[PDB]
């Protein structure tokens, strides 16, 4: 019943999926060996949305861990909650892609993608009523970006009527770690425009800001970043896995937050996020939840919402709350900020409510924004892309792996067209 | 005799039905395990040796809300095949609920309903609880209502629906859905009781002094209104009002069947000790704009026909007194082609109180259903919302991708326009 | 570029666009699908079916009846995918044979036919069909008029002159038509 | 700008088109 | 140029309307 | 898997290899007799019972440098077959090592390297260690790289070279060879880390406070750079960089693969106490003009892409902060067509310390590999020296006698001039 099959690719995607599985296993009460030990019975009602049941009352995640270097497979296997995963689901290459998109898409990923399609076919036929796929990857490298893009294309070709979510992390101009990041980012966005149903754009720079300013962690690591991302990932599907006063699955969110087919790029956010010292001075209420969630310094994508207009916003609340409070608060947000909301859509906000709060808190809220300001995210890349492509620098790796220059031209033109569409609807 | 079949569609209808059936069980002495340690016949069927199974059918294209009921405290009440559930929800899509996801469950719920009707000997009519703004509650209910109208025909179909509020809304594509289902409520319903959630929120926070009310409170209130409507079948009183004579009095022309419901007295148990809730006081609180179940101004239009359903310790003399006073109120104005504009049903059974509720134990209660032209205003605002989104053809690819046409959008809008104009025209005098 | 929606419609009539018969081939009514100029500013998939089938039929006959044998008229959705995959590949080939003279064809333009991006593809498609018939109905002694038209001139005076020659030809030939049909 | 020479080349195109279309019919009609 | 444009388009549309 | 075969040619190469292998042995806990009382798999093969044989191949046209190895403390490490030698050296002659004497012993070392490459399942590439000044390290290394490029094809070849100094030259014919070697390093190599001795002398005497250092200190520093390069292969860390990642991000165009290597912090034991060598300080040290391993002014050029290999107690956030500070500096200017120009790798294993060494113990280390047009200056000065000696046809007869042509010298000259012009061009902005 509405099963979700998860897919990881690359080091970034693999580590973020590992955090995701840790938190979700904690939610449903699964221990590191797969043995249910929770207290409430609800935790077993819809465990099957993510966990297959193997013999002897153990649960195995319905996830496919992919990469082109075995080091990441060993690192994931050796971590905590590592022994849950099926061994037959680790599909790895032997070299690595070398931050080259052409290698991930055409040369080596093309040879590896058949094993991945075999594993996803097995897992998906194993499930009763699939409802979609979740690809956690990064856009800056060769394995993550290009490999996940080839995988998304094939998946859409085989199951055309399913949901396709992506928690892709995008490059950021400030915190850059690779020289050839613009090329891979552009070439991947070109295909994410066509072959996915909703793309949750994360950005490492934004998470670093969340950690430095809000949580006041002196030295954040990648663990804390992946923790934030996993919090959003589970917050999206709480309603699938738990009851509530107003349910919302993934196709509901897709039908509500996407007015036109191409405009499916969202920015996520989470609440409440407080430091430790500042915790006892906070009133955990619905007003404070919504005030934090609609703040611009809390978004997980390095784009300021004040520069555009919310086409749509979704708020998924968790805990025992009043619906009068929720609705009055949403109306208040809309009325006070009337300029940040388009006019040919009345009631931009969709709200849902689940009855189970996250681990340890009494209530929480997840935020998804389809806003025009996301176009900034792309313009940056485009600028950088042009600044390199004009001189054709680093182009000979991509060419020697079999690509063309016409493909770079098409990718740039498609990114420009998406930017034009968003800007047009901004007015 | 005088049976009725309830169809609860979508999440809103299913939960409203949870409230309704808890209420009927408390009213009739029937335990949530079925046993009762006559009148129950209007809703329950006596199954062998002491087992009253409700004459209802729960539907959803999604497993969750029905599973709450299967594992809830009322699992032993409903018999398993009454609770029909699908696999994947309409996902806020009229086209999915109506055309693609809907067609797989329709024969199953129809077979169940037919088996339900073959057990009752004086079937009065169907009660259909749903919600305009949802995917299932809109599309699958359209489908079900069309099929029912074909099969049964002259039976009276009463629908109680959750109409989208002006400002407070939970979904984005909501206006779209709410328009398409109108194309059904005009033709395949006999009387449509539209109720908005924002008005019930204001009712709660003003009357019952509940600062943060949730869906359970609102559902209890709607359930109370339904109970007051069908009491005249389930009890004996001085003046009974059937469903057919009710519909005869309340609907002047075929197209005009969208009355407003309002219950009184709704007060907390604490301000109740000070109030002297006479027949006149609650009779008048019915005619106040603040006690409305839908956001509209009865002052902004003219009344056409009102039905007063009194419940409890009520004598006819003071009812006549109160109706004459209202007749002498100029802020309450009426059409001229309805010289006598009141139907009165008086009933003996006071309104029961659910444990854990907010309402108090009161002896007299009124349910007033008023066909007023002011309801047109409501439709107006929603239409405007539509014409914003539709101007850009936003979200339309979801619909046309699922077996719809754009011609259906255009037709639904033209139909709602003609409905508004017919209301404005029937209002005017001569 | 408003004339793009204009010349298109005129060029649409250039292929002999008759809104009635071309709506009759699809088995649907005209009142539910408006034709003309202001038909593709919004998502309009029915006018899309009609104009695309007419435009593909005017250029090719047999292969058109082949690639659109299991599709047209695409009234349902299982057979619709056939239309959307038979037309996109053809338009991609056509764009690749001409290159920069055509907008890059994207299947996403077919999920919602409308807006300026669809009108751009439609105008360049109409131009292509005009030209590939100027390549076949113009005389073997005048095939160069086709390539003379593919020569993207940049100066306005020569454009003026070319129009001038063509319009005097137009007047004289329409006058000779009268001579032939009357005398 | 370019938009006007494109207007000119398009109208030249239409002239050439319709003219050739009516020529191929009139040559048939006279015989 | 606009004058030749207008004469052009007018003759085009009106001659198209010839049966 | 992930094995790399390190070829050590000529005297300079064989000695830098003594240093490198001392380091690796001490790093993985492998005793000098080969026994270890995983990671070692990259640089060692595990033969039989706990015996590890390095994946290296020491070559030379002279036996004495290899005979010291065969008699030294590591005689029990390299199994005898890998320490290949001839009878007579090339005597600082390119033509002897390339044509005359190299042709007799190219096949032997080639058979040995083929044996080595067959035993590894994940070959990453080759690490050719040689000098530009000698006859073997220039001539035979050129011949070897030619045959290896014909044989193995796409395998990445990273060469670590000892380039002549601007001022201190120990040989007279040196420029000649150092010029002819260019004709190979352009086509057959994938990355060339040229290193000048004079700069390591200055780094020693300033940073380490070593009054007069010898070759052992220089070789220790070079080995430290090599281990920092291959660390992301042998051990695990935060961000990992293979060899192909390195080459992708560091090489903008094919002809441009001559990066400058530098290390931080190289302090004394005594000086390390007063300094707090955090990430910011070592990252700023990598960009200092006096810490380069080759003599040039990086202010006189423009950086094209730079890879930071951090090692030890390194978190990503302060790496990011230090890089942002490097960006907001005006003297470190970057080419325009490379807006994002920093590759970052972070490894968890801190840098080891050899006993009797000169470096201290640090918790963080950085190896910076930068592609900057400034390296062109180096070639310039050496080329000038060439243009001096070729002006008089001096020492040319020694080349012509053994099978070399003057056209070959003119050809190497044209090729190196073209390479300089390519750097001057790629530098300029639009
Ligand atoms: N008064 C009241 N309104 C509800 C309730 N549940 C949902 N709604 C409202 O009804 C509308 C949504 O209808 P849904 O029930 O969620 O739609 P649906 O019938 O499930 O169709 P799907 O989208 O396929 O689930 C919103 O106004 C909701 O706020 C309820 O229990 N009581
Ligand atoms: N940095 C460094 N340079 C060295 C070392 N040993 C020799 N050299 C330098 O390398 C250059 C000479 O190259 P050699 O290795 O001696 O010549 P070769 O490879 O033996 O070839 P032949 O002349 O034929 O014997 C001079 O700069 C030498 O000072 C060393 O251990 N470290
Ligand atoms: N949030 C987060 N970001 C990461 C993590 N690991 C890498 N990144 C970011 O992702 C980008 C590179 O991701 P990486 O994992 O190297 O992609 P890859 O495709 O696996 O790299 P490759 O195999 O082609 S060389 C960088 O921008 C880096 O900052 C992580 O664990 N968490
Ligand atoms: Mg990787
Ligand atoms: Mg020697």
- Is F411 annotated for ligand binding? no
Query: Cβ of A390: how many Cβ atoms within 10 Å?
Result: 11
Residue nearest to atom 13 of ligand 1 (CA): B134
Chains near F (3 or more Cβ pairs under 8 Å): A
As a whole number of angstroms, the distance between CA A171 and CA A184 comes to: 10
Which method was it determined by? Answer: cryo-EM
Q: Which of C128, C83, C76 is nearest to C102 (CA)?
A: C128
* DSSP per-residue string spanning A322-335: -HHHHHHHHHHHHH
Buried b (16+ CB within 10 A) or exposed e, F46-66: eeeeebbbbbbbbbbbbbebb
* CA–CA gap between residue F70 and residue F59 (Å, rounded): 12
Å from CA of F62 to ligand 5 middle: 6
Q: Is B135 annotated as a binding residue?
A: yes
Pairing assessment for the beta strands B342-347 and A90-92 based on DSSP bridges:
unpaired
Which residues 334-353 of A are in CB contact (within 8 Å) with B?
335, 343-352
- Report, in angstroms and rounded to the nearest whole number, the Rg of chain C calculated over CA atoms: 18
B11 annotated as ligand-binding: yes
Q: Which of A304, A293, A354 is nearest to A329 (CA)?
A: A293
Would you say B319 and B279 are in contact if contact means Cβ atoms under 8 Å apart?
yes
What's the F367 CA to ligand 5 centre distance in angstroms?
Answer: 30
Which ligand has the shortest distance to the CA of B101? 1
Per the CB < 8 A criterion, the answer to whether A341 and A305 are in contact is no
A418 SS3 class: helix
Verify whether residue B245 is a known catalytic residue. Answer: yes
Residues of E in contact with D11 (CB under 8 A): 5, 8-9, 12
Strand partners of residue B43: none
Nearest CA in chain D to E3: D8
* Token pair recorded at residue F146: 């030619």
Out of B68, B146, B198, B245, pick the active-site residue. B245
Contact between B83 and B58 under an 8 Å Cβ cutoff? The reply is yes
Helix or strand or coil: residue C26? coil
Rounded Cα–Cα distance for residues D18 and E16 (Å): 9
Domains and CATH numbers, chain A: 2-259 (3.40.50.1440), 260-373 (3.30.1330.20), 374-427 (1.10.287.600)
Give CA–CA dist B233/B389, Å, rounded. Answer: 45
Question: What would you report as the CA-atom Rg of chain B, rounded to the nearest whole angstrom?
Answer: 21
DSSP state letter for B359:
B
**Contacts of F319 by beta carbon, 8 Å cutoff, 6+ apart:** F279, F283, F308, F310, F344, F346
Q: Are A194 and C106 within 8 A, CB to CB?
A: yes
Q: Check residue F369 and give left, alpha or beta (phi > 0: left; psi -120 to 50: alpha).
A: beta
Calculate the alpha carbon distances from B190 to A297, B157, B425, C91, F414 in Å: 53, 5, 20, 53, 97
Q: Which residue has the tokens 């300033």?
A: F206
Instruction: From B20, B88, B131, give the residue whose CB has the most ligand 1 atoms within 8 Å, as the site to mutate.
Output: B131
Burial (Cβ within 10 Å: 0-12, 13-18, ≥19) of residue C70: exposed
* CB-based contact F324:A173 (threshold 8 Å): no
State the sign of the Cα–Cα–Cα–Cα dihedral B204, B208, B212, B213: negative
Torsions phi, psi of A268, nearest 5? -100, 170
Burial status of residue F8 (CB atoms within 10 A of its CB: 0-12, 13-18, 19 or more): buried
Distance CA B60, CA B66 (A): 7
Rounded to 5 degrees, φ, ψ at F311 are -145, 115
| Nearest by Cα to F234 from F381, F374, F347, F87 | F347
Number of residues assigned to chain F: 430
DSSP labels for F168-194?
A: --S-SSHHHHHHHTHHHHTTT-SEEEE
**Cα distance between residue B265 and residue B310, in whole Å:** 11
Please tell me whether the peptide bond between B187 and the residue prior to it is cis, using omega within 30 degrees of 0.
Answer: no
The Cα A224–Cα A209 span in angstroms is 12
Distances (CA, A) of A32 to A24, A41, A58, B90, B120: 12, 19, 10, 36, 56
User: Contact at 8 Å (CB) between F378 and F391?
Assistant: no
The DSSP result for A96-134, as a single string, is --TT-HHIIIIISHHHHHHHHHHHHHHHHHHSSSEEEEE
Q: Using an 8 Å Cβ cutoff, are F216 and F20 in contact? A: no
- Tokens for F84, please give them: 């290949």
Cα distances (Å, whole numbers) of residue F127 to B192, C116, F123, F159, F263: 84, 57, 12, 6, 19
Instruction: Output the six-digit token pair for F427.
Output: 């530098």
Task: Name F327's Cβ contacts closer than 8 Å, sequence gap at least 6.
Answer: none
Q: Count the helix, strand and coil residues of chain D and give each as a percent rounded to the nearest 5.
A: 95, 0, 5
Q: How far apart are CA C153 and CA C170, in angstroms?
A: 22
Handedness of CA B226, B229, B232, B235 (dihedral sign): positive
- Is the distance from CB of F246 to CB of F259 less than 8 angstroms? no
Q: Which ligand 2 atom sits closest to the C-alpha of F169?
A: 27
Q: How far is the alpha carbon of B390 from chain C, nearest alpha carbon, in Å?
A: 10
- Return the SS3 of F83: strand
How many residues comprise chain C? 183
Q: Are residues B165 and B197 in contact, defined by beta-carbon separation less than 8 angstroms?
A: yes
Please name every residue paired with B312 in a beta bridge, in sequence order, or none if there are none. Answer: B364
Decide: F and A in contact? Rule: 3+ Cβ pairs under 8 Å: yes
Residues in CB range of A90: below 8 A, 6 or more apart? A65, A73, A76, A77
Q: Check: CB of residue B292 under 8 Å from CB of residue B370.
A: no
Using CB atoms within 10 Å of the CB of residue B363, give its burial: 0 to 12 exposed, 13 to 18 middle, 19+ buried. Answer: exposed
- Give yes or no for a contact between F25 and F74, defined as CB atoms under 8 angstroms apart: yes
Backbone angles phi, psi at F235, to 5 degrees: -120, 175
∠ CA A95-F240-F368, nearest 5°, is: 120
Specify the residue for token string 């169907």: B126
Strands A202-203 and F303-312: unpaired
Ligand nearest to the CA of A182: 3
Element (DSSP H or E) covering residue B342? strand B342-347
Q: Could you tell me the two tokens for A39?
A: 């207290």
Q: Which residue has the tokens 């196709």?
A: A251
DSSP reduced 3-state for B163: strand
For each of the domains in chain F, give its residue range(s) and CATH number, in order of start: 1-259 (3.40.50.1440), 260-374 (3.30.1330.20), 375-430 (1.10.287.600)
A12 lines ligand 3 (CB under 6 A): yes
Q: CA torsion, points E12, E15, E16, E17, in degrees to nearest 10?
A: 130
Q: In sequence order, what are the residues at sequence separation of 6 or more whose Cβ sits closer than 8 angstroms to the Cβ of residue B124? A: B2, B3, B4, B156, B233, B242, B243, B244
By three-state DSSP, how is residue B200 classified?
helix
Query: Is D9 close to C130, i.e. CB distance below 8 A?
Result: no
CA nearest to A165, candidates A200, A124, A116, A193? A200
Q: Cα separations (Å) of A271 from A361, A369, B58?
A: 11, 14, 36
| CA distance linking residue B125 with residue B118, whole number of Å | 13
Give the integer Cα–Cα distance in Å for A412 and A385: 8
Q: Do A352 and B175 touch (CB under 8 A)?
A: no
Strands, E assignment, A236-277: 265-271
- CB-CB contact of B304 with B244 (8 Å): no
Q: Is F417 helix (H, G, I), strand (E, B) or coil?
A: helix
- Give the number of the ligand closest to the Cα of residue F90: 2
How many Å apart are CA F402 and CA F88, to the nearest integer? 15
For F191, other C-beta atoms within 10 Å of its C-beta total 22
Phi, psi of B312 (to 5 degrees): 115, -145
Residue numbers preceding breaks in chain F (C to N > 2.5 A): 37
Report whether B41 belongs to an annotated binding site.
Answer: no
Q: Which H or E element spans position B160? A: strand B156-163
Give the closest residue (by CA) to ligand 3 atom 5.
A12
Measured distance CA(A243)–CA(A221) in Å, rounded = 34
CATH topology of domain C2-150: Actin-binding Protein, T-fimbrin; domain 1 (1.10.418)
End-to-end Cα spacing for chain B: 44
Q: Contact F203/F221 with Cβ under 8 angstroms?
A: yes
Q: What is the DSSP string of F340-400?
A: S-EEEEEESSPPP--TT-SS---SEEEEEEEEETTHHHHHHHHHHHHHHHHHHTTTHHHHH
Q: Is there a binding annotation on residue B228? A: no
Q: Closest Cα partner for F21 from F63, F73, F67?
A: F73
The resolution in angstroms reads: 3.8
Tokens of B41: 């016949």
Which pair of structure tokens corresponds to residue B31? 């335990």
Tokens of A305: 């919402």
Those residues whose C-beta lies under 8 Å from the C-beta of residue A172, and which sit 6 or more positions away, are A203, A204, A205, A206, A302
Q: How far apart are alpha carbons F130 and F147 in whole angstroms? A: 16
Nearest CA to F17 out of F36, F43, F37, F35 is that of F43
CA pair distance C92, B19, nearest whole angstrom: 59
SS3 of residue F105 by DSSP: helix
Q: In Å, how far are A31, A42, A69, A360, F113 from A81, measured between CA atoms?
A: 8, 22, 21, 19, 44
3-state secondary structure of F162: strand
How many Å lie between the alpha carbon of A195 and the closest alpha carbon of chain C? 10
Within 13 Å and on the Cβ side, how many CA atoms surround B159? 28
Q: Using omega within 30 degrees of 0 as the cis cutoff, is the peptide bond preceding F265 cis? A: yes
Rounded Cα distance between C163 and A12, Å, is 61
Q: Tokens 């002297």 belong to which residue?
A: B276
Measure Cα distances from A242 to A353, B16, B25, C50 in Å. 10, 20, 28, 48
Those residues whose C-beta lies under 8 Å from the C-beta of residue B156, and which sit 6 or more positions away, are: B124, B125, B126, B190, B191, B243, B244, B247
Q: Are strands B52-54 and B44-46 parallel, antiparallel or unpaired?
A: antiparallel
Tokens of F64: 């004495």
Rounded to a whole number of angstroms, the CA Rg of chain A reads 21
Q: Are F2 and F42 in contact (CB under 8 A)?
A: yes
Of C137, C153, C163, the CB nearest to D24: C137
Chain A residue numbers touching B175 (CB-CB < 8 A): 346
Residues at CB less than 6 angstroms from ligand 1? A 246, 252; B 10-12, 15-16, 61-62, 89-92, 131, 133-137, 162, 170, 197, 215, 218-219
Q: F97 — phi, psi (to 5°)?
A: -70, -25
- Which bin fits F51, alpha (ψ -120 to 50), beta or left (φ > 0)? beta
Nearest to C107 by CA among A309, F342, A160: A160
Out of E1, E8, E15, the one facing C174 most closely (by C-beta) is E15
Number of other residues whose CB lies within 10 A of the CB of residue A280: 7
- DSSP class per residue in A211-274: IIIIS--SS--HHHHHHHHHHHHHHHHHHHHS--SB---HHHHHHHH-SSTT--EEEEEEE---
Name the β-bridge partners of F36.
none
Which two structure tokens, joined as six digits, stand for F249?
Answer: 């991000």
CA distance F54 to F51: 10
**Listed residue (A103, A107, A148) closest to A10, CA to CA:** A148
Q: What is the DSSP letter of F165?
A: P
C-alpha to C-alpha distance for F219 and A225, rounded to whole angstroms: 41
Residue A174 and residue A207 in contact, taking contact as beta carbons nearer than 8 Å: no
What is the C-alpha to C-alpha distance for residues A243 and A283, in angstroms, rounded to an integer? 25
Distance CA(B99)–CA(B96), nearest Å, equals: 5
The rounded distance, in Å, linking the Cα atoms of F409 and F181 is 11
């Amino acid at each position: 019943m509405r099963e979700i099959v998860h897919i990881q690719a690359g080091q970034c995607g693999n580590q973020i999926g590992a955090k995701f599985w840790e938190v979700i296993s904690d939610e449903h009460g699964i221990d590191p060996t797969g043995s249910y030990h929770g207290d409430s019975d609800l935790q077993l009602e819809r465990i099957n949305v993510y966990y297959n049941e193997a013999t002897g009352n153990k649960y195995v995640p319905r996830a496919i861990l992919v990469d082109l270097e075995p080091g990441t497979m060993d690192s994931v296997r050796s971590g905590p909650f590592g022994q849950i995963f099926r061994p037959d689901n680790f599909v790895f290459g032997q070299s690595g892609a070398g931050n080259n998109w052409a290698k991930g898409h055409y040369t080596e990923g093309a040879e590896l993608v058949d094993s991945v399609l075999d594993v996803v076919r097995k897992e998906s036929e194993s499930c009763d009523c699939l409802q979609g796929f979740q690809l956690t990857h990064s856009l800056g490298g060769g394995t993550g970006s290009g490999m996940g893009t080839l995988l998304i294309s094939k998946i859409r070709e085989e199951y055309p009527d399913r949901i396709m979510n992506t928690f892709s992390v995008m490059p950021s101009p400030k915190v850059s770690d690779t020289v050839v990041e613009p090329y891979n980012a552009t070439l991947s966005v070109h295909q994410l425009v066509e072959n996915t149903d909703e793309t949750y754009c994360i950005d490492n720079e934004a998470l670093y800001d969340i950690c430095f300013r809000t949580l006041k962690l002196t030295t954040p690591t990648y663990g804390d970043l992946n923790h934030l991302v996993s919090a959003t990932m589970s917050g999206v599907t709480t309603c699938l896995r738990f009851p509530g006063q107003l349910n919302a699955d993934l196709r509901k969110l897709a039908v509500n937050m996407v007015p036109f087919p191409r405009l499916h790029f969202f920015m996520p956010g989470f609440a409440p996020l407080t430091s430790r010292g500042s915790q006892q001075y906070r009133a955990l209420t619905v007003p404070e939840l919504t005030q934090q969630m609609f703040d611009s310094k809390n978004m997980m994508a390095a784009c300021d919402p004040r520069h555009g207009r919310y086409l749509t916003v979704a708020a998924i609340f968790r805990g025992r709350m009043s619906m009068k409070e929720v609705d009055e608060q949403m109306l208040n947000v809309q009325n006070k900020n009337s300029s940040y909301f388009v006019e040919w859509i009345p009631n931009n906000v969709k709200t849902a409510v689940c009855d189970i709060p996250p681990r340890g808190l009494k209530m929480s809220a997840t935020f998804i924004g389809n806003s025009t300001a996301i176009q900034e995210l792309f313009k940056r890349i485009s600028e950088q892309f042009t600044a390199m492509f004009r001189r054709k620098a680093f182009l000979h790796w991509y060419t020697g792996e079999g690509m063309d220059e016409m493909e770079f031209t098409e990718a740039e033109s498609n990114m420009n067209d998406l930017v034009s569409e968003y800007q047009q609807y901004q007015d | 005799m005088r049976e009725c079949i309830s169809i609860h569609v979508g999440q809103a209808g299913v939960q409203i039905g949870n409230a309704c059936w808890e209420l009927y069980c408390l009213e009739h002495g029937i335990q949530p395990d079925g046993q009762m340690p006559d009148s129950f016949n209007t809703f329950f069927s006596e199954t062998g040796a002491g087992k009253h199974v409700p004459r209802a059918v729960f539907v959803d294209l999604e497993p969750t809300v029905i599973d709450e009921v299967r594992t809830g405290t009322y699992r032993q009440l409903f018999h398993p095949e009454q609770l029909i559930t699908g696999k994947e929800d309409a996902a806020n899509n009229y086209a999915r609920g109506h055309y693609t996801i809907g067609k797989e469950i329709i024969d199953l719920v129809l077979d169940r309903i037919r088996k339900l009707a073959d057990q009752c000997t004086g079937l009065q009519g169907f009660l259909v609880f749903h919600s305009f703004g949802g995917g299932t509650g809109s599309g699958f209910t359209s489908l079900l209502m069309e099929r029912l109208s074909v099969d049964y025909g002259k039976k009276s179909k009463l629908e109680f629906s959750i109409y989208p509020a002006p400002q407070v809304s939970t979904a984005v594509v909501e206006p779209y859905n709410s328009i398409l289902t109108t194309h059904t409520t005009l033709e395949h319903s006999d009387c449509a009781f539209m109720v908005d959630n924002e008005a019930i929120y204001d009712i709660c926070r003003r009357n019952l002094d509940i600062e943060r009310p949730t869906y359970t409170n609102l559902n209890r209130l709607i359930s109370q209104i339904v109970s007051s409507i069908t009491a005249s079948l389930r009890f004996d009183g001085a003046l009974n009002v059937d469903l057919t004579e009710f519909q005869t009095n309340l609907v002047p022309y075929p197209r005009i069947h969208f009355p407003l419901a309002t219950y009184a007295p709704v007060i907390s148990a604490e301000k109740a000790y000070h109030e002297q809730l006479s027949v006149a006081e609650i009779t008048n609180a019915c005619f106040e704009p603040a006690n409305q179940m839908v956001k509209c101004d009865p002052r902004h239009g003219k009344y056409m026909a009102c039905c007063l359903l009194y419940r409890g310790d009520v004598v006819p003399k003071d009812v006549n007194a109160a109706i004459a006073t209202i007749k002498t109120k100029r802020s309450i104005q009426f059409v001229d082609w309805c010289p006598t504009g009141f139907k009165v049903g008086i009933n003996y059974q006071p309104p029961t109180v659910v444990p854990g509720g907010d309402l108090a134990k009161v002896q007299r209660a009124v349910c007033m259903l008023s066909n007023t032209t002011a309801i047109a205003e409501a439709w107006a605002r929603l239409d405007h919302k539509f014409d914003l989104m539709y101007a850009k053809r936003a979200f339309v690819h979801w619909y046309v991708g699922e077996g719809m046409e754009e011609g259906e959008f255009s037709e639904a809008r033209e139909d709602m326009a003609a409905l508004e104009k017919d209301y404005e025209e029937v209002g005017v005098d001569s | 570029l408003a004339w793009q929606r204009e010349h298109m419609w005129l060029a649409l009539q250039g292929l002999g666009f008759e809104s009635g018969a071309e709506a009759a081939n699809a088995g649907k009514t005209l009142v539910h699908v408006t034709f003309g100029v202001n038909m593709f500013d919004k998502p309009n998939k029915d006018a899309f079916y009609v104009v695309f089938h007419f435009l593909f039929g005017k250029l090719d006959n047999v292969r058109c009846k082949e690639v659109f044998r299991y599709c047209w008229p695409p009234l349902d959705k299982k057979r619709d995918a056939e239309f959307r995959k038979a037309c996109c590949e053809w338009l991609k080939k056509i764009s690749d044979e001409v290159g920069a003279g055509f907008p890059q064809v994207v299947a996403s333009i077919f999920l919602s036919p409308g807006g300026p991006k669809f009108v751009h593809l439609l105008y360049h498609f109409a131009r292509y069909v005009m030209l590939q018939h100027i390549k076949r109905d113009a005389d073997a002694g005048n095939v160069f008029i086709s390539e003379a038209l593919q020569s993207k001139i940049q100066d306005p005076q020569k454009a003026l002159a070319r129009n001038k020659l063509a319009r005097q030809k137009y007047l004289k030939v329409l006058q000779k038509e009268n001579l032939v049909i009357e005398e | 700008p370019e938009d006007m020479v494109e207007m000119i080349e398009s109208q030249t195109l239409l002239l050439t088109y319709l003219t050739i279309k009516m020529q191929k019919n009139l040559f048939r009609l006279e015989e | 140029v606009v004058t030749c444009i207008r004469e052009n388009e007018e003759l085009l549309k009106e001659l198209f309307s010839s049966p």
